[PDB]
């Protein structure tokens, strides 16, 4: 199956610029027409650039025309949006996005969609994480959840990895999207499911968060 | 990019039915192609149905063909989405975005683009049910200067909202009683945590107050080290 | 390029409805998507109606929607193109050709593509009634070499066929019976020329000979000069 | 409106070459997949090549492969079909076809087609046109019909221009397709419906039919 994995984004003061990437798998991006929407609370999905095939004509919203530019690099199959003299509403998770497709197995494909701040008065902020194992009092009602809180982390964007022992894990994996705080950072959740047999038959669980690629974890054991 | 008024979600039960839509509010829109994107929590966005200028031709999903039905009153400058035998693989944000069609023209260049505001639809067999507290315990390490949270977990309760509280309003610095979760049962969960000083603990006696007012319920629960 | 059997054509009058469909014939489909394409007598191609390959999606002309409707039976490797509320502007011949989608992929590429034979669809008001033949006399110029063609038109006649001889099959050398034309009255017409020695022009008197049992009516007709 | 315009083709005995063109009007033929597909009595319309955007990738059928070329010239805004080591089985009509964009005002554009036959014992032949004007017989009968009848033409394709006086006209203009006579040649009718005002308001009626670009024809007057 073709996939889009996004790369690039992060923290930037008004009137820095920033570059995303779009890496194309599965099929080469001059044939597509690629472009780029901003997510925002409240804004819904929003077009702010698309480039229309070998011709190289450009689409730009009103707001982004001259400051963003999209671009193809076919050479490594890959689709750029820098993004230059950016402002306090550019804030948004930006989505990877191609050309409809609409007789085919699924009409439309997406990046992941990687969180872009734009502030200033708000510095960078490693997350406060502190795992909890499963109560006596659950595990005597045959049911377990781990518990993993994540708080005090700007930009508010992070990404939870559940690891029995050292495998991934795969189900069970609940985790809210962050949301801010009273002193303007941002909060998160992540809950693992889990049924007595499996906690007390592993030697470890462990939950990995990681924001701007910062590995914080805890690990907790029945012992 | 300018905006549509969106409308129609909500919660309902399996089986169930919906409609959402999107219309112009005091102006005429340039009739053309419309989509509706949704993402489920945690997941990424996906295209479920499209539908051209004239509201001919039709785009479906696989996971969606036959319950939802797309439709357009351009006299009423509104794009419908009728929802119908929802599961729970529908509970999502719904999107009203425009495609982005092979343009080949100056004209669908600088066509405008419109947006919706994005509402959940919510598909949950369960309702109304009083909270399962739980203690999250303090650890083996505690210093005598500060590091010690404590907290309680709020499992498997039907509806949103409940209030939390530690100590009945009394201790109130430090907490954060962070947002629910929706899970596989269609129940909510959620946890609230206090970081405390560990001189405290084993003399001072904190509980957690968790109303849930929906079933006329609350707990007040100790956190007590093993 | 492998074929497809194609049925269901035939004549109807304004507001009927006929169903054409394409199948595979002794082996299953690899399923994609389908289109149907028409040609109106002397006009060129244009798509009326295309399907995904799940069945899901469809498209339809502006002049199609609402009274045609396209479905697949994938079970039964057919397409199928239901086609309600005819009328005279779709009098054409409906091919069965697979798309050309925007492919980006070497399964899009080599996929197998399906055509049907070409049915032909018409839609007419009218019914049986005889022709009106009339002499296409000869010209002012005749060289007594030979140079003189004289024929007679077979107008306004339904339906087809009309078998057209002259001088009751005595004169065979140098005809020309036409094809027939179907018109904006829903009417056949033809015209039958030959071209004789002009030296018995005045002396030999030609008649054309036009049945149409349809109707049970021949005419014989001459072609004097004027 | 957008159009596509095709030229080239015509006779060729078997082994010779011909290059159909497509002229693009209101779009560039590069951002669009363009493909020709041919159309014979028994077989339909069948896809035999198709280009797919930018990476020049091309699709043809087993039939063609190693005898046919498709190509853009970008400069030209031109689509090109080279067709060299052309067999019987070729003869066909040959139709520009683009890209479907299923969510637009039509879905897909053709090309008007034109007729490629491959055959070796038929020579050229230029067709007899004979014109008769409205009979009396049938103008005392309230209408009136022109009859320009096409015989003896190879290859059998034509197309008639019927001209009141000089400017050319609209309605009333049935015109069958070529049809194979006897001696292998082909044969065409065209009827121009006329009031009986119009034919005595007019100083000639002219039926222009051109074959191979062979402008032929004859003119009547009520005179």
């Known amino acids: 199956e073709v996939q889009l994995l996004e790369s690039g984004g992060g923290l930037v003061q008004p009137g820095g610029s920033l570059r995303l990437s779009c890496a194309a798998s599965?099929?080469?991006?001059?044939?597509?027409?690629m472009g780029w929407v901003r997510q925002a609370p409240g804004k819904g999905l929003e077009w702010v650039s698309s480039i229309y095939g070998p011709s190289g004509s450009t689409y730009y919203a009103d707001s982004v025309k001259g400051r963003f530019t999209i671009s193809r690099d076919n050479s490594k199959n890959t689709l750029y949006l820098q993004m230059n003299s950016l402002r306090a509403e550019d804030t948004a998770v930006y989505y990877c996005?191609?050309?409809?497709?609409?007789?085919?197995?699924?009409?439309?494909?997406w990046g992941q969609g990687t969180l872009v701040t734009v502030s200033s008065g708000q510095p960078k902020a490693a997350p406060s994480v502190t795992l909890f194992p499963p109560s006596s009092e659950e595990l005597q009602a045959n049911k377990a959840t781990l518990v993993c809180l994540i708080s005090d982390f700007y930009p508010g964007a992070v990404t939870v990895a559940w690891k029995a022992d050292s495998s991934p894990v795969k189900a069970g994996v609940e985790t809210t999207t962050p949301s801010k705080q009273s002193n303007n950072k941002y909060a998160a959740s992540s809950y693992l499911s889990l049924t007595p047999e499996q906690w007390k038959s592993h030697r470890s669980y462990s939950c990995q968060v990681t924001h701007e690629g910062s590995t914080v974890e805890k690990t907790v054991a029945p012992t | 990019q300018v905006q549509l008024v969106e409308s129609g979600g909500g919660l309902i039960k399996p089986g169930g039915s919906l409609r959402l839509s999107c219309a112009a509010s005091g102006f005429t829109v340039s009739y053309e192609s419309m989509g509706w994107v949704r993402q489920a929590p945690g997941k990424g966005l996906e295209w479920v149905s499209a539908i051209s200028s004239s509201g001919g031709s039709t785009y479906y999903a696989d996971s969606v063909k036959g319950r939802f039905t797309i439709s357009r009153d351009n006299s009423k400058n509104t794009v419908y989405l009728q929802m119908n035998s929802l599961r729970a693989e529908d509970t999502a944000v719904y999107y009203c975005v425009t495609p982005e069609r092979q343009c080949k023209q100056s004209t669908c260049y600088a066509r405008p683009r419109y947006w919706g505001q994005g509402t959940m639809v919510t598909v949950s067999s369960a309702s109304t049910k009083g909270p399962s507290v739980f203690p999250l315990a303090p650890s083996s390490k505690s210093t005598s200067g500060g590091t010690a949270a404590l907290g309680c977990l709020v499992k498997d309760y039907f509806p949103e909202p409940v209030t939390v509280s530690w100590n009945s309003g009394a201790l109130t610095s430090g907490v954060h009683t962070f947002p629910a979760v929706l899970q596989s049962s269609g129940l909510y969960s959620l946890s609230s945590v206090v970081t405390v000083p560990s001189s405290s603990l084993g003399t001072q006696t904190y509980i957690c107050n968790v109303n849930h007012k929906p079933s006329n319920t609350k707990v007040d629960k100790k956190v007590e080290p093993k | 390029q492998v074929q497809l059997v194609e049925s269901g054509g035939g004549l109807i009058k304004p507001g009927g409805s006929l169903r054409l469909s394409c199948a595979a014939s002794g082996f299953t489909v690899s399923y994609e998507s389908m289109g149907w394409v028409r040609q109106a007598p002397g006009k060129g191609l244009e798509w009326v109606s295309a399907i995904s390959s799940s069945g899901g999606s469809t498209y339809y002309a502006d002049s199609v929607k609402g009274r045609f409707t396209i479905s697949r039976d994938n079970s039964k490797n057919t397409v199928y193109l239901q086609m309600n509320s005819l009328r005279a502007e779709d009098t054409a011949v409906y091919y069965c050709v697979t798309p050309e989608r925007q492919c980006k992929q070497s399964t899009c590429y080599a996929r197998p593509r399906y055509w049907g034979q070409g049915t032909m669809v018409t839609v007419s008001s009218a019914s049986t009634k005889g022709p009106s033949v009339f002499p296409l006399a000869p010209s002012s110029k005749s060289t007594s070499g030979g140079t003189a063609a004289l024929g007679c038109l077979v107008k306004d006649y339904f339906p087809e066929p009309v078998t057209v001889s002259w001088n009751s099959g005595a004169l065979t050398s140098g005809v020309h019976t036409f094809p027939a034309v179907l018109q904006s009255s829903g009417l056949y017409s033809l015209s039958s020329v030959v071209t004789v020695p002009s030296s018995s022009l005045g002396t030999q008197t030609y008649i054309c000979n036009v049945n149409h049992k349809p109707s049970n009516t021949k005419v014989d007709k001459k072609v004097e000069p004027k | 409106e957008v159009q596509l315009l095709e030229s080239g083709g015509g006779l060729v005995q078997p082994g010779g070459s011909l290059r159909l063109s497509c002229?693009?009007?209101?779009?560039?033929?590069?951002?669009?997949?363009?493909?020709?597909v041919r159309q014979a009595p028994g077989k339909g319309l069948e896809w035999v090549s198709s280009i797919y955007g930018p990476s020049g990738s091309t699709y043809y059928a087993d039939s063609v492969k190693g005898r046919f070329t498709i190509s853009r010239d970008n400069s030209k805004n031109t689509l090109y079909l080279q067709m060299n080591s052309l067999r019987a089985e070729d003869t066909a009509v040959?139709?520009?076809?683009?890209?479907?964009?299923?969510?637009?005002?039509?879905?897909?554009?053709?090309?008007?087609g034109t007729l490629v036959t491959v055959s070796s014992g038929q020579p050229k032949a230029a067709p007899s046109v004979t014109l008769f004007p409205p009979s009396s017989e049938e103008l005392q009968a309230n209408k009136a019909t022109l009859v320009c009848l096409i015989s003896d033409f190879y290859p059998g394709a034509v197309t008639v221009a019927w001209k009141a006086d000089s400017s050319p006209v609209k309605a009333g203009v049935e015109t069958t397709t070529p049809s194979k006579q006897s001696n292998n040649k082909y044969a065409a009718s065209s009827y121009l419906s006329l009031t009986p005002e119009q034919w005595k308001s007019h100083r000639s009626y002219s039926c222009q039919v051109t074959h191979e670009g062979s402008t032929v024809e004859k003119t009547v007057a009520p005179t």
């Open positions: 996005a191609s050309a409809l497709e609409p007789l085919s197995e699924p009409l439309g494909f």
């Open positions: 599965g099929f080469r991006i001059s044939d597509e027409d």
